[PDB]
Single-chain antibody, 218 residues
């Protein structure tokens, strides 16, 4: 299990400043690291992959660097829209892991973002993730859990084309992944739910996260 440790939980900065967010793997992850930005009530947005390749769209301001065990995301001239949560991810080996995050703050209305369902302890739910606009079978689909206040946990993934599946052994007897090529819909079933299972569950594909669904157990 590869642990990713992020420097600080909170980093105060001010417009115009240079900031450096660091992440250290507890093992060599080579150059297989990505950085994500997350604004409140929003799905993570990809900023950098392969430790230093800026993703289409991302502004110059962002630079990634690092190799093997120390990684650094640097925002040159910080801007307002840069205030957000930043996450590093390792995809060298399974299970996929993430850093706890770094909220970058300084020194509005949220309604049903996302929406979900409230279920009962011991209950079981099956979430849908409908795809559109691309060949559903050619891309792996991941499921990530996000309890408020904490980081992201990779549950597992599945290759639509042949339903090949990988599970984080932590969720081995909780989750079950399936797909329906027929309608371009991936599904995930969580069983024997408990208070700890309350969170936002995202399905994601390389470079595009779903909006997630909130599951609440009470």
């Amino acid at each position: 299990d590869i642990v990713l440790t992020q420097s600080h939980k909170f980093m105060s900065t001010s417009v115009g400043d240079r900031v450096s967010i660091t992440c250290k793997a507890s093992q060599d992850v080579g150059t297989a690291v990505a950085w994500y930005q997350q604004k409140p009530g929003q799905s993570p947005k990809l900023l950098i992959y392969w430790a230093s390749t800026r993703h289409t769209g991302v502004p110059d301001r962002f630079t990634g660097s690092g190799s093997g065990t120390d990684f650094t995301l640097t925002i040159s001239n910080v801007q307002s829209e840069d205030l957000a949560d930043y996450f590093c991810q390792q995809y060298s080996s399974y299970p996929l892991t993430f850093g706890a995050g770094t909220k970058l703050e300084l020194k509005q209305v949220q309604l049903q973002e996302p929406g979900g369902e409230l279920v009962r302890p011991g209950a079981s739910v099956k979430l849908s993730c409908k795809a559109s606009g691309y060949t559903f079978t050619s891309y792996w689909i991941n499921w990530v859990k996000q309890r408020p206040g904490q980081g992201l946990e990779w549950i597992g993934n599945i290759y639509p084309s042949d339903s090949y599946t990988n599970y984080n052994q932590k969720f081995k007897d909780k989750a079950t992944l399936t797909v329906d090529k027929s309608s371009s819909t991936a599904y995930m079933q969580l069983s024997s739910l408990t208070s700890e299972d309350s969170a936002v569950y995202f399905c994601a594909r390389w470079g595009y996260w779903g909006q997630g669904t909130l599951v609440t157990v009470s």
